[PDB]
Write an enzyme that holds these catalytic residues in place. Sequence first.
Site, PDB file in Angstrom:
ATOM      1  CG  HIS A 174      -1.940  -1.095   1.407  1.00 17.60           C
ATOM      2  ND1 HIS A 174      -2.836  -1.274   0.423  1.00 17.60           N
ATOM      3  CD2 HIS A 174      -1.937  -2.116   2.221  1.00 17.60           C
ATOM      4  CE1 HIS A 174      -3.527  -2.392   0.668  1.00 17.60           C
ATOM      5  NE2 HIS A 174      -3.003  -2.845   1.693  1.00 17.60           N
ATOM      6  CG  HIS A 232       2.924   5.832   5.279  1.00 13.18           C
ATOM      7  ND1 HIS A 232       2.876   5.984   6.625  1.00 13.18           N
ATOM      8  CD2 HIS A 232       2.026   6.416   4.720  1.00 13.18           C
ATOM      9  CE1 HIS A 232       1.699   6.421   6.736  1.00 13.18           C
ATOM     10  NE2 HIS A 232       1.170   6.846   5.636  1.00 13.18           N
ATOM     11  CG  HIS A 278      -0.677   8.447   1.167  1.00 11.28           C
ATOM     12  ND1 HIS A 278      -1.158   7.360   1.152  1.00 11.28           N
ATOM     13  CD2 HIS A 278      -0.267   8.695   2.479  1.00 11.28           C
ATOM     14  CE1 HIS A 278      -1.500   6.668   2.656  1.00 11.28           C
ATOM     15  NE2 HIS A 278      -0.761   7.803   3.170  1.00 11.28           N
ATOM     16  CD  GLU A 319      -3.886   9.486   2.220  1.00 11.26           C
ATOM     17  OE1 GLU A 319      -4.756   8.554   1.807  1.00 11.26           O
ATOM     18  OE2 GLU A 319      -3.579   9.586   3.719  1.00 11.26           O
ATOM     19  CG  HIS A 348       0.812  10.718   5.573  1.00 12.41           C
ATOM     20  ND1 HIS A 348      -0.182   9.866   5.346  1.00 12.41           N
ATOM     21  CD2 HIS A 348       0.526  11.944   5.458  1.00 12.41           C
ATOM     22  CE1 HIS A 348      -1.148  10.646   4.794  1.00 12.41           C
ATOM     23  NE2 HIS A 348      -0.727  11.852   4.836  1.00 12.41           N
ATOM     24  CB  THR A 403      -5.749   8.103   5.536  1.00 13.57           C
ATOM     25  OG1 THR A 403      -4.500   7.800   5.272  1.00 13.57           O
ATOM     26  CG2 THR A 403      -5.873   9.627   6.170  1.00 13.57           C
TER      27      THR A 403
HETATM   28 ZN   LIG Z   1      -0.384   8.047   5.106  1.00  8.03          ZN
END
Ligand SMILES: [Zn+2]
Length: 256
Positions: free
Chosen positions: A61, A87, A89, A99, A112, A193
């Site tokens: 992910h 990590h 996104h 995000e 994040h 999230t």
């Molecule tokens: Zn995150």
Amino acid sequence: HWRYGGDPPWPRVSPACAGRFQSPVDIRPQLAAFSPALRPLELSGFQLPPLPELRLRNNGHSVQLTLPPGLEMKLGPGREYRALQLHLHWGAAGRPGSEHTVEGHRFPAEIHVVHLSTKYARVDEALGRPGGLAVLAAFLEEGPEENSAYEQLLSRLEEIAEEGSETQVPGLDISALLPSDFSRYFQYEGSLTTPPCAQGVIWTVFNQTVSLSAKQLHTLSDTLWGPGDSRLQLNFRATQPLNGRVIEASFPAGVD
Ligand SMILES: [Zn+2]
């Protein structure tokens, strides 16, 4: 377990993802509550020496960097945290993947850094408790030249391209992955999230972005594989309704 952009809808398996105070959210700076009590963020221990190395993993992910003990973050009186992992996104070729959004604007990517409150010894105890976890979020944008700090991670994505694979990277200055302006940020209470979407998370979103080269942004979004044999792309959650929550701003939004 779960996936981006497809079934099962997260509440079918993690009902808490249907909560009222979810993240991410659309930030509207002209409507944020100006709160001059929000003082510049304070970090310590983020400038890591080359050894020991840090774990970097493709979990299907995101790419996640495990952080060592000793990194401290203070949001203010009574709100001290220890960093756990960071990590990212991201989107896909010609498609942004942050995000959080700002006035509906989605940025190319987002970082994040996830922290545990010093009230708690283990992540398990903090989940779902108000202020138990805090995330620092910053937008990643395109700039003209290579970001040397990010290159230390991005140059290692090729070797963890397969879902579930892992590697080791030298210690680096984690604070160099973040904006230099620690005074101007937004803050609100939301959720993880990803499932289990636990609430009570304190979100701090820098107003200033960080700049990566177009090549770096392509490296981030085009290298990793996810579940099945799908590319790990567009790994962001849709923004969620505030449902009466107030987003605070540490600075005066202004004019234009
Ligand atoms: Zn995150």
